[PDB]
Structure 1
Amino acid sequence: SMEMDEKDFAADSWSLAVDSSFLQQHKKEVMKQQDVIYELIQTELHHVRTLKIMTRLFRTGMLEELHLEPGVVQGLFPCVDELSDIHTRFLSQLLERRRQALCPGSTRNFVIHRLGDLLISQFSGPSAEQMCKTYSEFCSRHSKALKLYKELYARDKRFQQFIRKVTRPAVLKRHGVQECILLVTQRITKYPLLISRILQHSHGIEEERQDLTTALGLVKELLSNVDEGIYQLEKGARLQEIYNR
C-alpha cells in the first residue's frame, strides 16, 4: 500500500480515525454506519495489497530470479493481473468517494452518505461479468496452485531459498503463497456480511436503504453464479474421471 492510504486507514475504526471534535458532531447511528463503511474500505485496501504481494513480490520475483519451466508461474498465480485490475479500480472508486467527502482544511474528517450506488455499479453490468468470470476461473484453479507450490518447495532448492528469503520479514507473517491464495478466495464471501451490517445502520435515508438492499441482492447473485461455475482442475486428471464427475 502507499503511505497516504495506510495512514488514513491506520486506526482500528472510523471513530478513532476522525478528530474527536468532528466525532462529537454526529448521531450514534451515523458513527455506527461510518465504522462499518470504514471496515469495508480498510479490508479492500488490505485485499489489493495481498494481490500486489502476489504480482510483484512473488510472481515477478520468480520470473526475474528463478529458472522455472514455462507455464509454472501462471499455474501458481492464476488470474492475478485480472484480479488486481478489478480490485484496484474498485478501491480507487471507494477512496475517491472518501476524498470528495473530506471537510476543507482536513485530510481525515469525512462522512460517506451514498455508498449504495457505487456498490450497485461494481456488482452489475460488465464489471460483474468480469468478476464472475475471473473468480470462477481462479477458484477452479485453487487446489492446482496449492499442489504445484508444495511440489516446487519440496523438490527445488532455489525455489525454497527464494520463498524463505522474500517471506522472512515480519510484515509478510500472514502472507505466504498458500495464505495469499486463500485470502483471495475468501474475499468475495466477506462482501454480504459487510454490506448487510452497513444496511442495518442506513435507514435514515430511504433511497440509501433501497440502494444497499439492491447491492446486497446483486452480490448474492454473483456469489451463487461463481459457486455454480466451480470444478477443481487437477494435474494428471484423465478425461474419464472428468466425464464421470
Structure 2
Amino acid sequence: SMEMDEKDFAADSWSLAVDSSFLQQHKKEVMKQQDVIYELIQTELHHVRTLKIMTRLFRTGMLEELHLEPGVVQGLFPCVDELSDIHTRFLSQLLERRRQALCPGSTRNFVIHRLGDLLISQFSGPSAEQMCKTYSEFCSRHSKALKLYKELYARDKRFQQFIRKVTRPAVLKRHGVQECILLVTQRITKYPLLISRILQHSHGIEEERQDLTTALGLVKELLSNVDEGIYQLEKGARLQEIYN
C-alpha cells in the first residue's frame, strides 16, 4: 500500500477518520452507511496489498533470488497478475469516488452517496466474466499451490531460508504464502456481507437502494458461478481418477 491511502484508512471507522466537527453535521443513519462503505474500501485496499505481497515479495523474489523454474513459481502463485489487475482497477475506482466526494480544504471529510452504480459496473459485463474465469481458475489451483509450497519448504534449504527471511518482519505476521492464498480465496465471499450491510442503511434514496439490491444480486450470481466452476487440481492426478 501507499502512505497516502494507508493514512486515509488508518482509523477503525469512517466516524473516527473524518473530523468530529464534520461527523456532527450528519444524521446517525448516514454515519452507519458511511462506516460500512469505509470498511469495504479499507478491506479492498488490504486485499490489493495481499496481492502485491504475492506478486512483488514472494513471486518476483523467488524468480530473482532462487532462479527457480518459472513453472514451479506459477504453480505456487496461480493467476496473481490477473487478480492484481482486476482488484487494483476496482480499488482505483473506489478511491476516486471517495476523492471526488471530499470537501474543498479537506483530505479526510467526505460522504459517498452513490456506491451502487460502481458495484453494478464491477459485477456485470466483461469485468464480471473476467472475475468469474479468474477465481474459477485460482480456487481450482488453491490446494495444489499449498502442497507445492509445503514440498519446497521441507526439501529445499535455499527456499526455506528465502521464506524465513522475507516473512521475518512483524508487518508480515499474517501474510505467509499459505495465508495469502486463503485470504484471496475468502475475499470474494466477503462482498455479499459488506453490500447487504451497506444496503440496510441505504433506504433514504430509492435509486441507491435499487442499485445496491441489483449489485447484491450480481455478486451472488458471480459467486454461484465460481462455486460451480471449481474442480480441485492435484499434481500427478491420473485421467482415470478424473473421469471417475
Scaled by the length of structure 1, the TM-score of the pair is 0.99
Percent identical among aligned pairs is 100
TM superposition shift of 1:215: 0.2
| Most deviating of 63-72 and 148-157 | 63-72
**How far, CA to CA, are the matches of 1:70 and 1:33 in structure 2?**
46
**How far, CA to CA, are the matches of 2:5 and 2:67 in structure 1?**
36
TM superposition shift of 1:24: 0.2
**How far, CA to CA, are the matches of 2:236 and 2:158 in structure 1?**
25
Provide, for residues 187-234 of structure 1, a one-character-per-residue CA deviation record: whole Å limited to 9, x for no partner: 000000000000000000000000000000000000000000000000
TM superposition shift of 1:70: 3.7
Provide, for residues 12-49 of structure 1, a one-character-per-residue CA deviation record: whole Å limited to 9, x for no partner: 00000000000000000000000000000000000000
Provide, for residues 79-115 of structure 1, a one-character-per-residue CA deviation record: whole Å limited to 9, x for no partner: 0000000000000000000000000000000000000
TM superposition shift of 1:181: 0.1
- SS of equivalent to 2:223: helix
**How far, CA to CA, are the matches of 2:223 and 2:120 in structure 1?**
15
Provide, for residues 94-149 of structure 1, a one-character-per-residue CA deviation record: whole Å limited to 9, x for no partner: 00000000000000000000000000000000000000000000000000000000
**How far, CA to CA, are the matches of 1:26 and 1:99 in structure 2?**
19
User: Retained in 1: the 8 A contact 2:33–2:201?
Assistant: yes
TM superposition shift of 1:68: 1.9
1:131 maps to which residue?
Answer: 131
TM superposition shift of 1:69: 2.8
**How far, CA to CA, are the matches of 2:151 and 2:37 in structure 1?**
41
Provide, for residues 134-179 of structure 1, a one-character-per-residue CA deviation record: whole Å limited to 9, x for no partner: 0000000000000000000000000000000000000000000000
Please state if 1:88 is matched with 2:91: no
User: Retained in 1: the 8 A contact 2:54–2:180?
Assistant: yes
**How far, CA to CA, are the matches of 2:154 and 2:174 in structure 1?**
21
Scaled by the length of structure 2, the TM-score of the pair is 1.00
1:57 maps to which residue?
Answer: 57
Q: Which ranges of 4 or more aligned residues in structure 1 deviate by more than 2 Å? A: none
User: Retained in 1: the 8 A contact 2:63–2:70?
Assistant: no
**How far, CA to CA, are the matches of 1:168 and 1:186 in structure 2?**
24
User: Retained in 1: the 8 A contact 2:29–2:201?
Assistant: yes
**How far, CA to CA, are the matches of 2:70 and 2:181 in structure 1?**
21
TM superposition shift of 1:8: 0.1
**How far, CA to CA, are the matches of 1:135 and 1:149 in structure 2?**
20
Q: Which runs of 5+ in 1 are unaligned?
A: none
Query: How large is the Cα RMSD of the aligned pairs?
Result: 0.4
- SS of equivalent to 1:114: coil
- Say how many residue pairs are matched: 244
**How far, CA to CA, are the matches of 1:155 and 1:69 in structure 2?**
16
**How far, CA to CA, are the matches of 1:175 and 1:21 in structure 2?**
37
TM superposition shift of 1:67: 2.9
